[PDB]
Design a protein around this ligand. Structure first.
Ligand code: FAD
Ligand code: WAD
Ligand code: OLA
Ligand code: K
Lengths: 579, 583
């Protein structure tokens, strides 16, 4: 139905024929976020649309870290795209090459993932400490149809054993799950990343770009698009799109914009495609400084207002209110980037992560979680420096806190009432810095910039099938929805992969491109991977240990083992350490 | 061990860094087969070896009485190494396009499928054509074979693991003819085939999973590689017969020291260092092939040509170099030996084929979509007509049919002689007979309207001979510093021989190991570990029966299924089973 899914090298390496009649078509891409950028690259590369017919409408005209960071090997659509984007750092190489080599020579992993009691490593760090009841809850969730998970919370499907496991510590902090978030999305994550469970506790599965996501992913694509003549249109806010929703078709007819404070309108025909990135987790963000809190806001911005205006033209365009209203005041809102050249801080980090922060390699290898922090705070030092023109004596630490309405342990205030230096103080406290030194180090030996993001948890809010518009709604002729609030099967939002996937599916479907789209990696269907998951989830126990204290399963196991003794199934189980 | 297996787009699209010290290395590739050429291409593209330091050593120096077809078995999408290679090889047909791009577009424009797979009784379609007619016993035997460890199948034959129900099934007709399996062949390799291609079980009977090049293999695969290699300065050396390679074998090292060659009559010797790599294609299924013509049989032979002599000479220097005798010796005389290429512009023959395969042979698109099997032919004969013409110099009013017989020592039904005693025109008459041509016309249409070239291949079944782990050398034997074995008599995991993929796979593995290239090699496709594929396979193997139909007969299975279903009622597992038609 205008696209199909594939895997393996045949479809990966094959090139689509130029799509029919693309020469008389144009594209309008609302926003210059990564999904729109990705949709424009696919239009250039696989649609062979001329860049002059491709219009990226962005609101803006013309340290803080984190647009994105962690990636994995099985970002199948992202790597398809970025093998074709030249590096801005290596000659005759793609962003993929740069990244692939970088991560070979300095492969990621954490030497200390969770701390407590002011800088001590958690004694069970590395184990999931899941009881058999918790594991059963995990499988039961995977065995639940997604259809049966409308509006279901994480707390509805897990008991306290689960929430007391180390597993949950590692999972909620690395992915930013709150207990009230969508069990649907939690389920997709479990199945989506099962091949990396072996790397969950020590982040051995993660891979990072050289610099921040903008210097390493966005700018390369902007440059790719500029060299192909893509028209970037600034000072343009898209307020509405008039869509004709009939019994047989949906056609976007008109883009209503404010172009430099002036109300204008872009008339569309059936051959003008519109790519809407609906919803935004970064909109309405505010910034503090070392002595000022990022001020809280519940303002809807352009992105949310546009989706709401689209949603009033058809329920098939989604339900933005499920995502941008009723966000619990406890949710993550604040992140901070703390910069310092102070040797005591840097040295304290080294004595925890066991790596020289200033060496230019992995440091924390991903977030260290402060497990007994009131704020449920985690922080990471990536490869330093994360910016191109930053002094090589400086580190930049990124801090976030899952709980926003709880007094700190040292700064007895909610993070939303904290200046940069105060967030720094709470962090240094949990690092174990002598409290007699913390205040001055935060105020005069560091600079910490907080950001308040009202919608940073928005992707994970409990939802129902239908709350997210399909990438190409039923009967849509020239309208697609892209990014992490659009609907596609199996893949997990809050990833850059999801933004590139939806962009590729939108371009391919709307132009009818005759090439397969890589399916979400088939890990949860791979018996090899499933064998490993059991092994790892049970903290490296074989099937005899797993069933030890249970009469019913040790009898079923016995029967099974008599049946499989000396077979290939036995050999597989042994290779995967289950026997 | 100097490699790793991978899958997914990350490693597929990634480029390896230039391997360490490759500027001081050279390569010698014995022969111009596809594996050797494939290796040369990986040397260029991923090794970044200088072309002038790559030396292809080929016997031949650079007279047949008709077009000859072969080498062009089908391909499938999940030839993972092959497409990794040919995405990088320029098409000679389409500008600005790889061989993959050309193949890809062609097979979407003219997808392959068969409209008539098995005939009998002189041109009549098999009534059950389409079905596997597998009994539950037979199905249990297939599954029981896959659940057997490879190690316990040493020297086991296919007749040792299957019984009467299976051998009487359409499945086995389809299977044995399309893959050229003999009942005495390796059950280990049959097992690898079962698992290797389980994702295509739905395409077995109508060939809808097969893909074909535009032209014969040499024009579509080999010649693009040769021009890639020559454009990069690669050295081709003709008139070179390699007789032996001196290998110093020691506790911690195997090193090729010397290549003993006959170069245009003269006994010569290429001296090697550890930095000169040698790639050996050990054994050959086409070695010692002889040709006949429309009036002459291809004369039978037992000669061990150069390839089999070279391997025996290597096997003498270490048991890690394999057992060539398990493959080139004691080949049964009933084995497939003869194929033939029958070329005609005669409208009665062409129209007769059209009436069977339901397509115009001369339109330039799929014709038979792969072999048609004559199920009741004494010879167990099959024949295919690919897209026409398979040769760029051939007239547009001509077709060329490829014909083979699995049984070489059995009288024909019309020409009452074994195929080995038959002239090109006699093979054609036996073929025409089974097409339904009136016997009054068969002699004249085979003798004056057709030109049939037979080929006798002593070793054409040799890939499938019953073997034991260890008979095939590893692609890079343990501790080998500059010696690799490539092609379909070298050992790698899971993959299936008698396929171009296996040749390219070994090539890739050899080059990557010997040069320590830091990029993943695509694993054999993971279909046999894929629950969705295994579900589809149960459905298809039981001729599209959901599980309730499958268990009707066994009141106890009817029960076990009763329980399973309540354990999974309303769950994802149920939904998957319904999606894959088992409920
Ligand atoms: C701090 C942070 C860290 C992250 N880290 C990771 C990570 O480590 N790994 C990972 O996989 N993922 C991560 N993510 C998720 C990832 O960043 C997102 O999935 C992705 O960046 C979203 O891209 P998008 O363009 O689809 O969404 P957006 O970029 O939000 O798309 C909307 C954009 O278009 C513009 N726009 C919106 N509305 C309008 C309008 N009406 N008119 C004009 N312009 C408009 C806005 O400027 C906005 O930026 C992270 C996200 C954040 C916020
Ligand atoms: C496990 C394999 C790949 C996982 C995909 C990663 C993307 C996860 C996503 O939920 C966004 C993360 C949000 C911010 C949390 C802190 C960042 C920690 C981190 O970068 O992992
Ligand atoms: C696990 C048991 C498997 C059950 C039977 C498996 C059947 C495999 C079937 C079909 C393959 C059909 C042909 C696919 C491409 C062949 C390419 C070639 O000729 O080399
Ligand atoms: K899929």
């Amino acid at each position: 139905s205008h696209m199909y899914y594939s895997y393996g090298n045949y479809e990966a390496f094959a090139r689509p024929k130029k799509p029919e009649n693309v020469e008389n078509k144009s594209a309008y891409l609302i926003g210059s976020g990564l999904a729109s950028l990705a949709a424009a690259c696919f239009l250039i590369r696989d649609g062979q649309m001329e860049g002059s017919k491709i219009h990226i409408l962005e609101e803006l005209p013309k340290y803080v870290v984190r647009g994105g960071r962690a990636m994995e090997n099985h970002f199948e659509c992202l790597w398809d795209l970025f093998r074709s984007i030249p590096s801005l750092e290596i000659d005759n190489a793609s962003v993929l090459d740069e990244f692939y080599w970088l991560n070979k020579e300095d492969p990621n992993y954490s030497r200390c993932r969770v701390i407590e009691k002011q800088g001590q490593r958690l004694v069970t760090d590395g184990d999931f400490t899941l009881t058999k009841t918790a594991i059963k809850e995990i499988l039961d969730l995977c065995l639940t149809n997604e259809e049966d998970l409308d509006d279901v919370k994480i707390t509805d499907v897990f008991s306290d054993d689960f929430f007391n496991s180390n597993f949950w510590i590692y999972w909620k902090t690395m992915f930013a799950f709150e207990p009230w978030h969508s069990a649907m999305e939690m389920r997709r994550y479990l199945m989506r990343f099962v091949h990396h469970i072996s790397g969950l506790a020590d982040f051995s599965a993660l891979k990072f770009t050289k610099y921040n996501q903008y210097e390493s992913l966005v700018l390369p694509m902007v440059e790719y698009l500029k060299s192909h003549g893509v028209q970037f249109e600034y000072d343009v806010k898209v307020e509405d799109i008039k869509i004709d929703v009939t019994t047989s078709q949906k056609i976007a007819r008109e883009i209503l914009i404010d172009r430099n404070g002036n109300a204008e309108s872009i008339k569309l025909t059936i051959n003008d495609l519109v790519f809407v990135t609906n919803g935004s987790i970064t909109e309405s963000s505010t910034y503090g400084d070392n002595d000022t809190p990022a001020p809280p806001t519940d303002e809807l911005g352009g992105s949310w207002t546009l989706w709401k205006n689209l949603a009033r033209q058809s329920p098939e365009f989604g339900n933005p209110d499920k995502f941008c209203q009723n966000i619990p005041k406890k949710s993550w809102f604040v992140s901070a980037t703390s910069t310092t050249n102070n040797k005591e801080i840097i040295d304290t980090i080294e004595s925890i992560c066991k790596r020289d922060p200033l060496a230019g390699k992995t440091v924390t290898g991903g977030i260290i979680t402060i497990n007994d922090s009131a704020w449920q705070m985690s922080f990471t030092i990536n490869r330093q420096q994360q910016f191109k023109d930053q002094p090589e004596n400086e580190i930049s630490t990124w801090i976030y806190a899952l709980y926003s309405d709880v007094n700190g342990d040292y700064i007895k205030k909610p993070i939303t009432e904290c200046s940069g230096n105060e967030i720094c103080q709470e962090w240094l406290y949990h690092l174990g810095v002598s409290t007699d030194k913390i205040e001055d180090l935060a105020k005069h030996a560091s600079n910490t910039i907080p950001v308040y993001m009202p919608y940073i948890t928005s992707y994970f809010m409990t939802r129902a099938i239908g709350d997210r518009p399909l990438v190409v709604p039923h009967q849509s002729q020239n309208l697609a929805f892209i990014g992490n609030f659009a609907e596609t099967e199996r893949d997990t939002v809050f990833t850059t992969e999801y933004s590139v996937r939806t962009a590729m599916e939108a371009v391919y479907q709307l132009l009818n491109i005759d090439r397969g789209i890589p399916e979400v990696i088939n890990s949860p269907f791979d018996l090899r991977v499933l064998m490993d998951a059991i092994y790892e989830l049970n903290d490296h126990q074989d099937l005899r240990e797993i069933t030890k204290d249970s009469k019913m399963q040790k009898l079923a196991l016995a029967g099974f083992l008599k049946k499989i003794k000396g077979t290939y199934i036995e050999s597989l189980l042994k290779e995967h350490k289950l026997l």
